[PDB]
């Protein structure tokens, strides 16, 4: 009965569509972007990547058992970190740049101290307590991290003590992705049950649940302002969710594409939504009109990860063919 | 125009790339196998002569080849997410319990699920039908009937070409090749030539399954080579 009342409020809320509100705006038209660089030296599939805050540096993880940080401008490998386990579904760079984190099927998040005396990378803190594989790790601050897991629970940790300060438990399936808000006070999770939840880190309870997806939502990202997020699914449709309105405004779908979205990312302005597909091509969507503007196809294998640089300069996409390529 | 510090950084990067290439050549030598079996199938006891909550790993080498065996013991019933990672494996060792007739249909459906998976399409399956001794004991007791679980066994005749082992009853042979025929009948229509199945009858107390895995791995690599050299 409560669910019916909740659905009734959403229906009355929507007076107009984002398409019709948007329709009196100039199209972006056609945008073309060419691969400025390609980063060799990965011997196996690239599962995930994350840009640094400075945006010169990025970290990428692979099945080969190596977590290697790059200098993007010069294409030079800054560090090379032997990984104890070849299974790694995620990597994360701290906002300050001192730490880089790694998570995988071994049920542990490993925190690596990049900057230290003796000039080698060592494991500052190994985090344990999750029953399922860690799908995504993201740093709130240097001292605290949040990890999304396949056991249907997201957790917030503190790195010094190594114990879960809070646990987030409202999902019914594996949590595939986690995306932190710009203000850090709240985050949004995407999970295989096809519902996206808005969590609050301080209170440890779900504020909102959005369910406009038929299939699992693989990847999820915040709009830059922080009042909206976008999801990516095996449905081959990307859906733009709004927090304050509490309903989905827009859906991005085309009849040609039928493959799942591996990764979603937003431009700094928020006009362009970049989506990475299993069909070996990343499609640039005008987020406000749901009209395709271009394709970024230079990968033989699937594009596992996509990331937009903090200064907005670049887009770096890692793919299963082990080559990672900036697209300025 | 590169600074002295930038030249030193490039030298560091080249040394790192050299060490990475050395580790990659070390990694290419070993062969990798994914083990996927239900409980009671004795999946842990497939290999015993020679031998981390998410993955339990056992490494065995026979005749100058290194085999890397991966078993996932820290996941729920549904396996579709972590199965995507194991797409580069040389072969899959699928274990099914022949003795437990109630769970055999579940094993058959699991075989359909693994065989028809999109990521595990090109990979071949080395099938091990375990506990043949227990199957023989059950049919010797005779209370259990395979016909009641599957109607087709009630009218079945053993193939003439198949050679029985010494001391093997014809109805024991009938049941064994019946279960094998069901699994291989799933295998046949789905493959299309990209991969194939290697049905093997394995007692619980069997001295060598490493020799069987090695021979089927050689066959997989040989067929990959025959496909790569444009012979087929």
């Amino acid at each position, epitope marked *: 009965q409560l669910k019916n009342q909740i659905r009734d409020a959403r229906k009355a809320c929507a007076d107009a569509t984002l398409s019709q509100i948007t329709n009196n705006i100039d199209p972006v038209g056609r945008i073309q972007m060419r691969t400025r660089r390609t980063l060799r030296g990965h011997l196996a599939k690239i599962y995930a990547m994350h840009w640094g805050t400075d945006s010169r540096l990025l970290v990428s993880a692979s099945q080969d058992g190596k977590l290697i940080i790059w200098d993007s401008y010069t294409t*030079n490998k*800054v560090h090379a970190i032997p990984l104890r386990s070849s299974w790694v579904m995620t990597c994360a760079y701290a906002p300050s740049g001192n730490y880089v984190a790694c998570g995988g099927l071994d049920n542990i998040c490993s925190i690596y101290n990049l900057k230290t005396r003796e000039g*080698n990378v060592r494991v500052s803190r190994e985090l344990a307590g999750h029953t399922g594989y860690l799908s995504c790790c993201r740093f709130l601050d240097d001292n605290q991290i949040v990890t999304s897991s396949g056991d249907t629970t997201c957790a917030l940790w503190d790195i010094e003590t190594g114990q879960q300060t809070t646990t987030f438990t409202g999902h019914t399936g594996d949590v595939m992705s986690l995306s932190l808000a710009p203000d850090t006070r709240l985050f949004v999770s995407g999970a295989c049950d096809a519902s996206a939840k808005l969590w609050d880190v301080r209170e440890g309870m779900c504020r909102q649940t959005f369910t406009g997806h038929e299939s699992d939502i693989n990847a999820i990202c915040f709009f830059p302002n922080g009042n909206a997020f976008a999801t990516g699914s095996d449905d081959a449709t990307c859906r733009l969710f709004d927090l304050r309105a509490d309903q989905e405004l827009m859906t991005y779908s085309h009849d040609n594409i039928i493959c799942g979205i591996t990764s979603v990312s937003f431009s700094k302005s928020g006009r362009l939504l970049l989506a990475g597909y299993d069909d070996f091509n990343c499609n640039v969507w005008d987020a406000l009109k749901a009209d395709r503007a271009g394709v970024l196809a230079g990968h033989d294998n699937r594009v596992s990860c996509l990331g937009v640089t903090d200064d907005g300069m670049a887009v770096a996409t890692g793919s299963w063919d082990s080559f990672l390529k900036i697209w300025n | 125009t590169v*600074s*002295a510090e930038d030249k030193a*950084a490039a030298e560091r990067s080249k040394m790192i790339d050299k060490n990475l290439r050395e580790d990659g050549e070390k990694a290419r030598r070993t062969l990798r196998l994914l083990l996927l079996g239900a409980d009671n199938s004795g999946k842990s006891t497939i290999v015993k002569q020679m031998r981390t909550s998410g993955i339990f790993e056992t490494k065995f080498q026979v005749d100058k080849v290194n085999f890397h065996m991966f078993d996932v013991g820290g996941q729920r019933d549904e396996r579709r997410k972590w199965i995507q990672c194991f797409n580069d494996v040389t072969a899959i060792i699928f274990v099914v319990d022949s003795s437990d007739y109630n769970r055999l249909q579940e094993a058959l459906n699991d075989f359909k699920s693994i065989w028809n998976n999109r990521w595990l399409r090109t990979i071949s399956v080395i099938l091990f039908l375990n506990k043949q001794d227990l199957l023989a004991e059950k049919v010797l007791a005779g209370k259990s009937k395979i016909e009641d679980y599957f109607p087709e066994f009630a009218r079945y005749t053993t193939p003439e070409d198949a050679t029985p082992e010494p001391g093997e009853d014809p109805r024991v042979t009938r049941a064994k090749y019946f279960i094998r025929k069901e699994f291989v009948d799933i295998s046949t229509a789905s493959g299309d030539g990209r991969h194939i199945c290697y049905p093997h009858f394995t007692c619980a107390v069997d001295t060598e399954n490493a020799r069987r895995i090695f021979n089927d791995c050689k066959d997989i690599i040989l067929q990959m080579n025959l496909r790569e050299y444009n012979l087929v």
Partner: single-chain antibody, 226 residues
Framework: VQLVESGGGLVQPGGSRKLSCSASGFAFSSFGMHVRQAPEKGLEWVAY????????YYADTVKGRFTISRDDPKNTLFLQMTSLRSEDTAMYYC??????????????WGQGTTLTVDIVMTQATSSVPVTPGESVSISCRSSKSLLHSNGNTYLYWFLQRPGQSPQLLIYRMSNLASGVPDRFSGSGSGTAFTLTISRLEAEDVGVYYCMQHLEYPLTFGAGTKL
């Protein structure tokens, strides 16, 4: 993290002497190693050996008769000198350096051993007497611009307390060295480089050396004693 050294003593001219630097406490293979000091003069660069010994440079005044080799399993590097002369008396410092994006080379220096027998970097070499609590500014000029096209400016400031090997204060004129108090601050435009200190206090009186790193050979400053 230590860098002990051995060898020295009286040596007749034209002889030979092997100086060894045994590192113990860090990953010796990842650090490119390098410096001497006359009895009454500033620091003078000598040589350099890269990671894996893939690159070597020498000062022109010691070219053709100085050799360096590093025993990575032993965690030690040596300096083989032949045809010594009266002007080679100095105290040799074993200095580490690691080169990547955001690194801090010359961070740690050796103890030093007494042995007895281009970009021109200018320092005023005159420093007002030390006054606690009063700001002090030390300026070092350069012959050519040290700001490379990539945007990094290659200046390093080193402080030598009396009776202690010099310590890195600032790397690239704007980035503070690790473990040093925040009061030190460096700034300046091209060819006009300054080091500013606020809230001066004890345990800071020493000689301030300005070093360049745009290209070899590395030329130090004359030094400004407080």
């Amino acid at each position: 993290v230590q860098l002990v050294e051995s060898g020295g003593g009286l040596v007749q001219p034209g002889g030979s002497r092997k100086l060894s630097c045994s590192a113990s406490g860090f990953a010796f293979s990842s650090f490119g190693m390098h410096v001497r000091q006359a009895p009454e003069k500033g620091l003078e660069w000598v040589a350099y050996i890269s990671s894996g010994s893939g690159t070597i440079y020498y000062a022109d005044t010691v070219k053709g008769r100085f050799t360096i080799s590093r025993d990575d399993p032993k965690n030690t590097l040596f300096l083989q000198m032949t045809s010594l002369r009266s002007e080679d008396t100095a105290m040799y410092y074993c200095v580490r350096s690691i080169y990547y994006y955001g690194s801090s080379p010359f961070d740690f220096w050796g103890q030093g051993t007494t042995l007895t027998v281009d970009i021109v970097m200018t320092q005023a070499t005159s420093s007002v007497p030390v006054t606690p609590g009063e700001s002090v500014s030390i300026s070092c000029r350069s012959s050519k611009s040290l700001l490379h096209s990539n945007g990094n400016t290659y200046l390093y400031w080193f402080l030598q307390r009396p009776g202690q090997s010099p310590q890195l204060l600032i790397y690239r004129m704007s980035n503070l060295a690790s473990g040093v108090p925040d009061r030190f601050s460096g700034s300046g435009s091209g060819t006009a480089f300054t080091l500013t200190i606020s809230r001066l206090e004890a345990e800071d009186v020493g000689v301030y050396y300005c070093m360049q790193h745009l290209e070899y050979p590395l030329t130090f400053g004359a030094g400004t004693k407080l």
